[PDB]
Amino acid sequence: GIDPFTAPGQLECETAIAALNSCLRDLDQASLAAVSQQLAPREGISQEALHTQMLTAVQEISHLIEPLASAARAEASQLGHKVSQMAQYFEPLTLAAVGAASKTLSHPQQMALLDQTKTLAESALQLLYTAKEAGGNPKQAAHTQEALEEAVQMMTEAVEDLTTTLNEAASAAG
Numbered sequence: 097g098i099d100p101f102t103a104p105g106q107l108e109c110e111t112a113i114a115a116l117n118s119c120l121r122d123l124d125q126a127s128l129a130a131v132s133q134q135l136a137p138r139e140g141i142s143q144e145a146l147h148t149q150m151l152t153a154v155q156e157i158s159h160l161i162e163p164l165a166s167a168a169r170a171e172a173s174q175l176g177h178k179v180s181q182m183a184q185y186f187e188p189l190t191l192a193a194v195g196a197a198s199k200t201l202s203h204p205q206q207m208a209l210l211d212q213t214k215t216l217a218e219s220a221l222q223l224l225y226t227a228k229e230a231g232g233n234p235k236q237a238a239h240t241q242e243a244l245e246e247a248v249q250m251m252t253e254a255v256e257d258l259t260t261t262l263n264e265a266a267s268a269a270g
Contacts (some may be wrong), residue, residue, distance in 0.1 A: 103232030105175035119190035123214035130197035138195025153185040156219035172232020205265040209261040216254035223247040
């Protein structure tokens with residue numbers, strides 16, 4: 097949580113990066129454990145509720161992704177607020193995805209949303225990474241301007257992607 101740049105948000109992004117990085121490892125180990133029956137069935141949720149929890153989070157993530165993109169490039173004092181929101185939704189997503197991983201023995205939908213959550217988490221990680229650089233400061237982030245764009249679009253891509261598996265998982269995993 098250090099500011100090597102010159103703005104608010106640099107802190108929030110790096111602190112969230114630490115948390116988001118942790119969920120990446122959790123998800124990555126989930127896919128490894130679930131593929132070897134080394135994972136326990138969810139944390140504390142049912143099958144259709146997974147579709148509920150994950151989808152509800154993803155939507156609100158995407159909801160904040162756009163305002164965060166705007167914030168990361170300029171809104172320094174606002175960026176931190178977006179980061180707080182983005183990071184918090186990814187936690188249940190991780191939990192829920194790891195849940196679906198070990199719990200869903202229906203179809204590849206299990207591994208699909210497990211991986212997609214991780215993909216979206218990596219998308220958000222790349223997002224928080226670029227947001228930490230550019231946060232409120234377009235100057236020391238000239239090339240970061242480009243990557244911040246790739247990241248924001250990377251999220252919305254994985255957003256639709258995970259959402260597909262989740263929404264179908266109603267009958268595809270239920």
